[model samples]
Target: SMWELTILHTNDVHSRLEQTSEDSSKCVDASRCMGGVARLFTKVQQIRRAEPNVLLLDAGDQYQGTIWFTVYKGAEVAHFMNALRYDAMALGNHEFDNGVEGLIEPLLKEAKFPILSANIKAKGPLASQISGLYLPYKVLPVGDEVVGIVGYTSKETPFLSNPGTNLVFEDEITALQPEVDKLKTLNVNKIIALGHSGFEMDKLIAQKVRGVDVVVGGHSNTFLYTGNPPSKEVPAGKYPFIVTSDDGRKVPVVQAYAFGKYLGYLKIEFDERGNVISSHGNPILLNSSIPEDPSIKADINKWRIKLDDYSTQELGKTIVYLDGSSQSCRFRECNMGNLICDAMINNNLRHTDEMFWNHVSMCILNGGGIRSPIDERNDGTITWENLAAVLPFGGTFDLVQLKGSTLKKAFEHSVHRYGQSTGEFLQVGGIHVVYDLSRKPGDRVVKLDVLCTKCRVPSYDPLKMDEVYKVILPNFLANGGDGFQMIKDELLRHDSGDQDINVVSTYISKMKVIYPAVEGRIKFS
Candidate 1:
């Protein structure tokens, strides 16, 4: 017997509940927002009405990235996920941003469905809190047959976010094999690896793991399409990227882009032996044309009152728009990144004694820290809500001293993943650098110049290999987030005890009408 099934999926929603502003780079009009929970509900309901055997799944990362998560914490996520009725979800790195106790415990208590992670093993208090709440795999009955789902989270969560020491994450392949074998023991042959390990790891798992028919992935926010892309979003790969296993069996992988921008839909047919005979579908764009579910919209509105005081308060104004979109910051120098680094440097100079101003030489910010773009509105007004959205993590500032050679090594690490668009790329202030991406990784940085320590006007000087330089950076990176172990260990550091959003907001208010432009602080050839 041949069985058919439909899978509706989303990943990396990042708590974008309301429709985006009309001027937002992600949306086409103010009348319609892309990827809000209301539209998602409407679309899912439409599909369920027509299809009998369907599973709605999330590939993980329902936490962090907005005021919704920052204000409501995991409670809002639990309410919505339960309302939408997701079958299962993988654990994402950001789910631990508030630590295990704040997010995991509350989420496990509230979410109606299973929160799955095959690689994570809880210990001590965490183990007790999530004893029966978490699962390695789950079997779901659909129509006349059953399907098995095994979940896996990123092994890099400890270094990428704050999962803490209580939870241990193992390699995805090793953790997943036993669970698949266990499911097979119960006569379930159709297995899916629903994971939050990013696009590269998803492809690798499909190729390496046996008995896995499909993979739904997240974390890289990759957009996959079989035909022309629906909107401005560029496709990362094919809709269902097909990979052949070690034994020559074909496996399919799919991912919806981040921020609820698109819903991944894949239709498949399996033979009696549980081999996928056919599979096809593309991500459905939740654009303005789609209608919002009125009840869900009302629920979102009711929850939104808590944010009104912060969202409506004016912060400052931008004379020129700031670009912090991943396309800009991750690949090259961007205005928003420059504005942030400059603000950090300015804040340090103002607070430090005038005699010690020369000691503070530069500022370095990770591209990933700048989450969203600052659009140019008709009035050019900036709000606290806008700034909060831009730097939602509320990362504090830290001043660190490093040897010039070690600083150069940090620069090399930043650009190592140049074309691949990793967020570790550095957005710098008070330094000018030229790199040739065509060359090998360590050798890419050909020219490095730092501002003169004693200069009245900003002037460039060659970085002395042995001299020590003081630099400003977010505390997250200072503590070695995003694989910046070199910065964390090889430096003498001081905490500024200042939140980044507050620093930037203060700078904007002081400047009144600020114009931050990219003046080639970083040049890539």
Candidate 2:
């Protein structure tokens, strides 16, 4: 006899607490918009009422990206997830955006679900503070049989987000195998490998791990569909991307697109031996067609109390779509990065004088700092919320006059992991650089050209070892965030307390209708 199990999952929701347009901007008309927690709640309730055995899970990233996360931190996340009654959730890198403090608050103090991550361990004094806050695996009795869930986090989180120095992350396969084995020993046959690891890693775990029947993932926010994609996002694979397990078992992997756009739904039939006999279901598109759960809608309204007029106030409009999506910005120079860097330098010029032979002329922003792209499809309207979401870290500008040699060291760090999803990737203005990514990391930088700040007219010149150039950067970069140890406060000539969003907003408003392009400032060979 086969046993039926329904798994309703979400990943990389990224704190989109309100109904958004198809492009993820503020929804002016509900009839045309898609994805809000209330709509999702309505669907989950419907499915729950119909299914005999159902498990609600989230793969991670319940924080960051919108004004709610900016205002309530993780508390809003906890409140909403509690209302939805998530059975389990994995830890996303953004959960540590506020350091360990954010995790403890809404999640530890308030969340009803079991937060799971087998690979995360805190070292030093924070060890005690972090311990017992989460579980490695959860054994839940669903229907007539026992189901085991082994959870793990990404190894690259330290460099990806602000997860302080004390935490240690292990490889997902390393952390997951042992936990699955432990569950098997406890007489739990059916197992689900759930985590914030990306789609690629999830596929690897599905193949390498022995006992896992399903691999539900997050981090990359891969959209997998069977038929036509319901939204603009192209599908990475089938709804349940399949893999053969190490011990000769079939495993199905799934992940919904980010920002509460869709809810992943997968139904699996388990054989008498706990092998996955069959799997089905699609990521249900939570568009305006779905009725909003009235209670959740009311709660969302209450939550919006914290977001004042300043957050929603319209700024200037963007004539072009700003590409700040994690896939584009983390790997290459993006349009939004270009605009932000230009704005940073443009804003800094206000403090300069005519004697400006070499004023602070250049700026570098880490690709990680740029989030959510402003889509031209969404009426091209630029609001304070949109800009804030673009640069949500609340980082300040640190003007540093460092040697060209120091800049090279910083650049090397930026390109250290050439092929990986790197948050430390450099996005710049006022300079052009050529890189041979095929070469080793430190030697990858083939050519460096610095725009002459001292010149009567702007011109590109080779970076000199001894020449000092003024550059503006975020406080996080100045204080060694994203594992950048080369740039420090000791070298800071001036610490402009101006907020990043404020600086960009000033430039955007002044321009009225802005059109930023990805002019090849950084070339890859």
Candidate 3:
């Protein structure tokens, strides 16, 4: 006997409850939009009506992107997930952005569905906070047969987001194997490993885990498709990228691109023994043609009313487009990245006394902190809402003193994962460095120069190993977030306590008309 299942999935929705802006590529017309929760609701309803054995799942990161998440926190995420009636969700790293108390506790209390993360160990006071909120695996009866769904979150969450000290994350394979073994003993043959561990780890889990027949993933915002991508997104790899397990069974893996832009639809056929015989799917682009569910649309409107003040407050203008797109900032030195780093350094210069000016030599901003592009507006106007979207995390600025040698080590750390879109990439100001990706990690830097400590005009001098330099960076990185552990200790430390968005806003306001170009502050040899 053959059984068929239709899986409707989304990952990294990131609180995109409304349609894309008029300038967004997803929005072809000023009135038409794409990937809002309302349209997703309408599409999911249509799919379920046509298919009997369907599962509505999300692969995590339903939190922390736009003003919706900023204002409502996890409450907004819970509201839409409940309305969509998701069967299960994996915990995304951003879910812990507000720390456990602000995010995990509220989400646990409000969500209608099960949250899963097999690799995370909730201990101490944190365990009590989320005692009944999550599980390692869930069993669902689908048309007289049962399917086991196991969930895993990124082990790197603690380094990337603020999960706090109470939660301990373990290696993915180590935590998942026992769970899969437990499921197999229960005679469950169909097992789906639904996780937010990114594309590489998804493939690894598919190859290493014994019982899992399918892996649905998130966290990398990867776009996987078979043919020409039906939407504007360029395909990263094939949809349902097949991985052969050690036992020689083929396991299919899939991930939909982030920000509610696409809905993943996968159809799998299983034999009587629950082994997958065939699988195929594509990411369905949620464009303007799809109508929004009226009920959810109305719900979004209610939330919009609360955001009007923020949406309308004019901040400043940009003569050139600020490119904060993930692809640009994460991989290379982008103009927006340069602008932000320069703003940070300028903010520090303004606040500090003249005697301290020589000690402040550079500013280091993380690429991952830049969340959105400031699209070039025809009117060249920007609003608070636009700025908030760009720097949504609202981390405060921090000044730290480090040895010149330690500074180089920090630069080495930033380029350790060159060519990959890792959050640790550094965008620098007031320094110039040349790096060769062909060299090994830690040896990537070819040349390092810092702005002269007491120069009258902008001048460059060789970095002295013994010299202590004061640098401006986000508080998150100063606290050793994203593996910038070398800068954790400080000879002297100062917290500006000024929100990052405000710093950039102030810089842009002062400039009146800003045109930041990506010069060779960071260069390739």
Candidate 4:
């Protein structure tokens, strides 16, 4: 007799229990909108009832990203996950956002399910003893087969995690290959790689690592619907390959769309020997079609009541509506992003009395960190909700010491990543730069100058590569979070303590009411 197993997976929820401010346009049941924790719970419960051998898994990123994680600091998120009874969850890079203390607050303290991060290493405090607590692999008994589940985090964890987690994060494939060999030695025919290294990394691992049968992935937030796989070209001899092995062996892979919008399900049929024979899967749209789970809904409601007073506590008001639309954000530099970067720098003045700040030559922000624009609805009244949407990650200011030449190179590097084809340069402030579209790639910025509050006019030259100057940027970028690799070695110092005085709140406070205006921090001809 063939035993059946149903695997359900969710990834990159990022604490989004409701529709994203951008996703509010998605309609549900004519009157409702798509997404919510309640809908996810309902879908999971329904699947559980339908399939007795079903297992619910999460591909890391169980924390951070929203007011939910920001306000509660992963406590409420843990509670909700515990209530949902996730079977096993991999650790995503974002899971360590607040450092080890925040990461542990949920896994060891609040989670009802087991937390696994195969590639993570904890050193210094309890390096030897506590290391095993962050297990790399776990074996679960389902029917007669012992399903070996091994988890791996992104190698980018070093850049993604907080400063203190200096614990070395190894390559996902290298760290996980041994675990797969161990599982195979145990005669476990069924193996699943629970990975949080993003989709592309997962594909790479499946191709290189052997003995892994299935992979549930996260981090990239890529969607894999039932229609023919996104790419058809498959290299040979790659194990744990996309959806399965290159040998045509069944290695089902699935992940729900980020947030609570959809619940991903992968139904697979396996031979008696425990090899997957066939598989099919789809994302269940968790719209109004699925009633909210009363318990989770109650939890959301309780938090809603607590947050109701907080959301509109009047951080500040805007006189005119600012445009933070995707169209405005895509091609052109955003004044909103510049204003937020300025707010971060200005607010941290009290934290550090460094004269370099007043001499602050340049204010730069990572394009990725600026999640939303500052524009609110027509009312011109910016509420906490609007502010949160504007600077969703709530980053803090950090000062880095880079030469003027290096800073200019950093700008070029930033622009290079933006693909310069459509002038997708990183938003900048405190400096005036003129770039020519016709110029060659490296020398695009023809005129690059920095202005100090004390200086009558901006003055700086990029040709002198050894010009060291203190620059202000988000701590994330200073640490090389969004591919700003130029500043990696030049990071003279950093300060993430001022994260509480959110940029949006500070921006609103500075200008009693905000109006949409392109401050011209960036210009292109």
Task: List model 3 lDDT by residue over 272-345, tens digit each.
Answer: 88899999989898877889899999998888898775746456788898898889888788899898887887
Backbone clashes in model 1, listed as residue pairs:
none
Query: How many clashes does each candidate structure show, in the order listed?
Result: 0, 1, 0, 9
Q: Rank the candidates by TM-score, best first.
A: 3, 1, 2, 4
Which residue runs does candidate 1 get wrong by more than 4 Å?
Answer: 22-29, 351-358
Q: lDDT values of the candidates?
A: 0.85, 0.84, 0.84, 0.66
TM-score against native, each model: 0.95, 0.92, 0.96, 0.79
The model with the greater lDDT, 3 or 4, is: 3
Candidate 3 global TM-score? 0.96
Which candidate tops lDDT? Answer: 1
Provide the lowest-lDDT 10-residue window in model 1.
21-30
For model 2, what is the error of residue 94's alpha carbon versus the real structure, in angstroms, after optimal superposition?
1.0
Worst 10 residues of 3 by lDDT: 22-31
Measured over all alpha carbons after superposition, the RMSD of each candidate to the real structure, in angstroms, is 2.0, 2.6, 2.0, 5.9
Candidate 2 Cα errors over 4 Å, as ranges:
123-128, 350-355, 376-380, 409-421, 437-443, 488-497
Model 4 per-residue lDDT at 322: 54
